[PDB]
Amino acid sequence: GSSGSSGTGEKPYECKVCSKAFTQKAHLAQHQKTHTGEKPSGPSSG
Ligand SMILES: [Zn+2]
């Protein structure tokens, strides 16, 4: 089963649907386009 393993530290940009982390916003923002899905705000809002 998938594991939420990560390296020492945490990225400022992270997805919710796929749960992927990006180095920059441009990448994430653009990535979303792929998802092409409309979902609510999950837990751990922070
Ligand atoms: Zn995503």
CA distance 37 to 39: 6
Q: How far is the CA of 2 from the centre of ligand 1 (A)?
A: 16
- Which tokens hold the place of 3? 């594991």
Q: In what helix (H) or strand (E) does residue 21 lie, and over which residues does it extend?
A: strand 21-22
Q: How far is the CA of 15 from the centre of ligand 1 (A)?
A: 5
What amino acid occupies position 44?
S
CA distance 36 to 41: 15
Look at the chain and report how many structural domains it folds into.
Answer: 1
Q: How far is the CA of 20 from the centre of ligand 1 (A)?
A: 6
Please state the φ and ψ torsions of residue 43, each to the nearest 5 degrees: -70, 180
Question: Method used for this model?
Answer: NMR
CA distance 10 to 21: 8
Q: Which domain holds residue 15?
A: 1-46
Give the CATH number for residue 11.
3.30.160.60
Q: How many residues does the chain have?
A: 46
CA distance 16 to 10: 15
Q: How far is the CA of 32 from the centre of ligand 1 (A)?
A: 5
Q: How far is the CA of 23 from the centre of ligand 1 (A)?
A: 13
